[PDB]
Amino acid sequence: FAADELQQRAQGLFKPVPAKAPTLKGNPASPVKVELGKMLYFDPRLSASHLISCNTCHNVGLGGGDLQATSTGHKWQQGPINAPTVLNSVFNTAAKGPVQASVEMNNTPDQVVKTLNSIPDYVALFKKAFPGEKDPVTFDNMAKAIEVFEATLITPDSPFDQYLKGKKKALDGKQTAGLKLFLDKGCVACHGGLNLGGTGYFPFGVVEKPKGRFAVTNTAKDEYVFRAPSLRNVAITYPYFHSGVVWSLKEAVAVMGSAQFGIKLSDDESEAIAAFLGSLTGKQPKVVYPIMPASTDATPRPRL
Numbered sequence: 455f456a457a458d459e460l461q462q463r464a465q466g467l468f469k470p471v472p473a474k475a476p477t478l479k480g481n482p483a484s485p486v487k488v489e490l491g492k493m494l495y496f497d498p499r500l501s502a503s504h505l506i507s508c509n510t511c512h513n514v515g516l517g518g519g520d521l522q523a524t525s526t527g528h529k530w531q532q533g534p535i536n537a538p539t540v541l542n543s544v545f546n547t548a549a550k551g552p553v554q555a556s557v558e559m560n561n562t563p564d565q566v567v568k569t570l571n572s573i574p575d576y577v578a579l580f581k582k583a584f585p586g587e588k589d590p591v592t593f594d595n596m597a598k599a600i601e602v603f604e605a606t607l608i609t610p611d612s613p614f615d616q617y618l619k620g621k622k623k624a625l626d627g628k629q630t631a632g633l634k635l636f637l638d639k640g641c642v643a644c645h646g647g648l649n650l651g652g653t654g655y656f657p658f659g660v661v662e663k664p665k666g667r668f669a670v671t672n673t674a675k676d677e678y679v680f681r682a683p684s685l686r687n688v689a690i691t692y693p694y695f696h697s698g699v700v701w702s703l704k705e706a707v708a709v710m711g712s713a714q715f716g717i718k719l720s721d722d723e724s725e726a727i728a729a730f731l732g733s734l735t736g737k738q739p740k741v742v743y744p745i746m747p748a749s750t751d752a753t754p755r756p757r758l
């Protein structure tokens with residue numbers, strides 16, 4: 455069939471989001487370290503101001519992102535960039551890492567550890583989640599708990615996963631079309647894999663110009679690479695591109711049939727393709743809001 459072959463094909467070029475959180479190297483999972491990681495992820499006491507947590511910009515009930523064109527949350531950033539989703543971030547390859555870069559932006563490791571040492575409940579959770587350690591309340595221990603909570607922030611069973619799994623009836627007519635167009639148009643070169651993307655860097659980026667106020671450019675000439683985003687849950691993580699300038703997901707497909715790629719796109723193939731991309735929305739994780747423990751007289755105060 456022309457099917458059993460879009461489908462035996464895709465089965466090859468993509469893997470589904472696994473049932474369970476993956477293993478992190480150096481950093482075993484446990485109910486307690488996951489509880490701890492989640493407490494921290496939601497605690498705005500990690501910012502010097504007591505105003506920002508990771509959820510502020512990576513909102514688990516609104517697709518893992520912040521709905522904003524751009525923001526600055528990591529110290530390595532040369533200015534506002536669009537916040538990627540935390541959802542399925544663990545599968546990407548995109549004190550060097552996300553928690554540390556965040557903390558050193560809004561705080562110093564020092565005040566963060568003074569803050570955690572200051573609350574008995576947190577000390578006690580650090581001791582359960584990292585046992586047999588003399589001093590388990592460390593900057594590095596804290597990032598590791600958060601990472602193990604992040605690892606649970608995956609979205610199994612989108613219509614597409616249910617398709618690579620077997621079921622052809624998981625995609626509809628217009629999304630099965632869309633797919634073929636996605637492969638056929640080479641889409642899957644740059645945005646394929648376990649995570650449809652999150653994996654390569656390309657001398658390719660969306661730009662203003664000083665039907666298509668926006669389009670692609672070659673930045674080889676500037677030794678500038680951008681990573682090619684995971685496309686999972688993209689229907690829920692607008693606006694689009696590093697600068698968050700495209701709001702319509704149809705547009706964003708129309709900006710990505712660039713000359714620069716050897717790809718032409720019809721207004722109706724973009725359509726088909728946006729409707730394929732809709733299929734990439736998985737089951738949103740179920741998070742019980744953490745009950746974070748009260749500060750004590752010893753806890754540093756908001757700083758200004």
Ligand code: HEM
Pocket residue numbers: 495500506507508509510511512524525526527528530531534535536537538539540543544546547548552553556557600652
């Ligand atoms: C400790 C709390 C946070 C955690 C655990 C966390 C997690 C992450 C991760 C995992 C990434 C990169 C994702 C990937 O490679 O798939 C990231 C990037 C990003 N986040 Fe956060 N995040 C936190 C706080 C924030 C905050 C508070 C903001 C505030 C405005 C923010 C805005 C952004 C931006 C703009 C990026 C991308 C930076 C770049 O690509 O250069 N994040 N975060």
Ligand code: HEM
Pocket residue numbers: 636639640641642643644645656658659660680681682683684685688691693694695696697706707710711715717727
């Ligand atoms: C028709 C096929 C393609 C489609 C539908 C497509 C779709 C998309 C979408 C929807 C985004 C925005 C995701 C977000 O903002 O989270 C994006 C960004 C991006 N993709 Fe494409 N893409 C295609 C082909 C390609 C190719 C061939 C490459 C290799 C050169 C590539 C690499 C990239 C890069 C580097 C970005 C980031 C641009 C920026 O943030 O400024 N993609 N794509």
Ligand SMILES: [Ca+2]
Pocket residue numbers: 519536537538691692693694695698
């Ligand atoms: Ca976005």
